[PDB]
Amino acid sequence: MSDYLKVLQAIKSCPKTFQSNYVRNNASLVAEAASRGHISCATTSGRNGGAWEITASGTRFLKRMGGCV
């Protein structure tokens, strides 16, 4: 989960990182977030608009759990 933690949250702090198009390929990482308790879905159809996004809350708890390290 260490790698996953930063995947969604990284983009809100530093754009493009792991959420923009990365979600479509590494959806399993983003799916872990359901266990952490916070996620948001844009369309999940393609990889451009159909991606997931993090909520403001997710960045605080999830990243501190050892995000990337």
Describe it.
The protein has 69 residues and is mainly alpha-helical. It has one domain (1-69). 46% of the residues lie in helices and 6% in strands. The chain has 5 helices and 2 strands. It has helices at residues 2-13, 22-25, 27-31, 33-36, 58-64; strands spanning 40-41, 52-53. The chain has a two-stranded antiparallel ribbon. It is globular, with a radius of gyration of 11 Å. It starts with a helix and ends in a 5-residue tail after the last helix.
What is the N-to-C succession of helices and strands?
A: HHHHEEH
Global morphology: globular
Compute the number of helices.
5
Q: Could you give a short account of the major beta sheet?
A: 2 strands, antiparallel
What's this, in brief?
It is classed as transcription. The protein has helices at 2-13, 22-25, 27-31, 33-36, 58-64; strands at residues 40-41, 52-53.
Architecture blueprint of SSEs:
Layout: H1 2-13, H2 22-25, H3 27-31, H4 33-36, E1 40-41, E2 52-53, H5 58-64
Antiparallel strand pairs: 1-2
Helix pairs in contact: 1-5
PDB class: transcription
Keywords: Transcription effector, anti-sigma effector, transcription
Assembly: monomeric
What are the defining features of this structure?
two-stranded antiparallel sheet; mainly alpha; 69 residues; Fusion protein 5.5/5.7; monomer
